[PDB]
């Protein structure tokens, strides 16, 4: 099945999801010369007082930190959305090496890892019916830099070892996401896809401007995971990331000057 190895990664994935050559594909390259300013744009609201938190999973391609999803206790709205989108589940993308493992890049620049924090449009009921709409998913992207750590990371690498291999998952109740948050809400946003397997074009998709940095400690060990099974030969989870694909006019807003 689908991965990021040479016989399995992204050169390959059309061939079981033909999507992966269509209108509307993420990650792209956003071009900050080119990505216009629109003053209709509203701020993002970010409601993450009330998230629970649930477990960590590894289903061998990251790891996700899973909500509870049957309320709206953590949610997304404003921004370019017209609707309330709660958060489900938030993991991250990230490369062997410090220079490379952001999905977005930014006028041709990547960053050492991306986080995803995805929604769901509340309209729809279910991710599983979101999954099925062009206006279904809204994905907050946040570039990770390597430099001082982020505290509010911490608890997120203390608990890699107890799921280093596919299917291990993990208590993780009462975590904040908003430590996750740089200070500032201002984007970029464009219509886009799934970055992995089944590729769908569901995504509005809302990319900070301001990294977050993490230390090479915090890094290191993400690095550590393994794509495969417990009793299986060890691969490391590393260069877990797409790369840009074609923009195909789409035209990337940005919320500020
Ligand atoms: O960002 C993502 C959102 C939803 C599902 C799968 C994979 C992803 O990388
Ligand atoms: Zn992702």
Same mark, same amino acid.
């Given at each position: 099945?689908?991965?990021?190895?040479?016989?399995?990664?992204?050169?390959?994935?059309?061939?079981?999801?033909?999507?992966?050559? +269509?209108?509307?594909?993420?990650? /792209?390259?956003?071009?900050?010369?080119? %990505?216009?300013?629109?003053?209709? !744009? &509203?701020?993002? #609201?970010?409601?993450?007082?009330?998230?629970?938190?649930?477990?960590?999973?590894?289903?061998?391609?990251?790891?996700?930190?899973?909500?509870?999803?049957?309320?709206?206790?953590?949610?997304?709205?404003?921004?370019?959305?017209?609707?309330?989108?709660?958060?489900?589940?938030?993991?991250?993308?990230?490369?062997?090496?410090?220079?490379?493992?952001?999905?977005?890049?930014?006028?041709?620049?990547?960053?050492?890892?991306?986080?995803?924090?995805?929604?769901?449009?509340?309209?729809? +009921?279910?991710?599983?019916?979101? /999954?099925?709409?062009?206006?279904?998913? %809204?994905?907050?992207?946040?570039? !990770? &830099?390597?430099? #001082?750590?982020?505290?509010?990371?911490?608890?997120?690498?203390?608990?890699?070892?107890?799921?280093?291999?596919?299917?291990?998952?993990?208590?993780?109740?009462?975590?904040?996401?908003?430590?996750?948050?740089?200070?500032?809400?201002?984007?970029?946003?464009?219509?886009?896809?799934?970055?992995?397997?089944?590729?769908?074009?569901?995504?509005?998709?809302?990319?900070?401007?301001?990294?977050?940095?993490?230390?090479?400690?915090?890094?290191?060990?993400?690095?550590?995971?393994?794509?495969?099974?417990?009793?299986?030969?060890?691969?490391?989870?590393?260069?877990?990331?797409?790369?840009?694909?074609? !923009? &195909?006019?789409?035209?990337?807003?940005?919320?500020?000057?």
């Amino acid at each position: 099945h689908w991965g990021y190895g040479k016989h399995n990664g992204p050169e390959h994935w059309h061939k079981d999801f033909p999507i992966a050559k +269509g209108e509307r594909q993420s990650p /792209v390259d956003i071009d900050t010369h080119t %990505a216009k300013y629109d003053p209709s !744009l &509203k701020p993002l #609201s970010v409601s993450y007082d009330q998230a629970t938190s649930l477990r960590i999973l590894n289903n061998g391609h990251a790891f996700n930190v899973e909500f509870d999803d049957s309320q709206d206790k953590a949610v997304l709205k404003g921004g370019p959305l017209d609707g309330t989108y709660r958060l489900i589940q938030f993991h991250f993308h990230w490369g062997s090496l410090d220079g490379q493992g952001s999905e977005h890049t930014v006028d041709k620049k990547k960053y050492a890892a991306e986080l995803h924090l995805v929604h769901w449009n509340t309209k729809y +009921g279910d991710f599983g019916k979101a /999954v099925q709409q062009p206006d279904g998913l %809204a994905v907050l992207g946040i570039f !990770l &830099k390597v430099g #001082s750590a982020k505290p509010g990371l911490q608890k997120v690498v203390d608990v890699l070892d107890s799921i280093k291999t596919k299917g291990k998952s993990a208590d993780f109740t009462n975590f904040d996401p908003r430590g996750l948050l740089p200070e500032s809400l201002d984007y970029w946003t464009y219509p886009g896809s799934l970055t992995t397997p089944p590729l769908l074009e569901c995504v509005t998709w809302i990319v900070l401007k301001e990294p977050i940095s993490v230390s090479s400690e915090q890094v290191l060990k993400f690095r550590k995971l393994n794509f495969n099974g417990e009793g299986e030969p060890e691969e490391l989870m590393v260069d877990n990331w797409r790369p840009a694909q074609p !923009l &195909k006019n789409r035209q990337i807003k940005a919320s500020f000057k």
